[PDB]
Amino acid sequence: GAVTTSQIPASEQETLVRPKPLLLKLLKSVGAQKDTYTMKEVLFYLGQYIMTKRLYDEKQQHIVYCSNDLLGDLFGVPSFSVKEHRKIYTMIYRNLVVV
Numbered sequence: 001g002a003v004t005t006s007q008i009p010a011s012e013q014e015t016l017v018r019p020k021p022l023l024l025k026l027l028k029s030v031g032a033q034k035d036t037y038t039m040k041e042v043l044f045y046l047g048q049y050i051m052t053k054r055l056y057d058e059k060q061q062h063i064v065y066c067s068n069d070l071l072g073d074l075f076g077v078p079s080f081s082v083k084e085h086r087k088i089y090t091m092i093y094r095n096l097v098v099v
């Protein structure tokens, strides 16, 4: 129910957040059953989502294409690198309240 990364301080990935309605629906579409999460939890579910709807079928280039997927609207970008973790958190932050 969680994924952490070496690029973000360990404590930041425990930050408690309430996803805004769109982020929440994405989380809930892949099993999430609550409204309040830690950032590492959100990242886990977003990761699941990204892979259920095949937004990242090509693993060897580390790009998630999402221009015409909900994730694209959530992030407001057509695509992004899965290696650029700070940016991902940045984009996620916009779509939630920090408890």
Ligand SMILES: CC(C)(C)S(=O)(=O)C[C@H](C1CC1)N1C(=O)[C@](C)(Cc2ccc(C(=O)O)cn2)O[C@H](c2cccc(Cl)c2)[C@H]1c1ccc(Cl)cc1
Pocket: 003, 004, 005, 006, 007, 043, 044, 046, 047, 048, 050, 051, 056, 064, 082, 083, 084, 085, 086, 088, 089
């Ligand atoms: C199945 C896995 C391997 C458990 S996963 O982590 O859920 C897979 C997804 C994949 C859809 C893009 N994903 C990743 O593959 C990679 C890049 C795999 C990875 C994890 C850790 C480290 C490290 O600590 O150095 C390096 N690489 O991680 C993406 C990730 C994970 C946690 C936070 C962020 Cl911001 C990104 C992470 C990811 C990227 C984007 C989002 Cl929105 C969510 C998760």
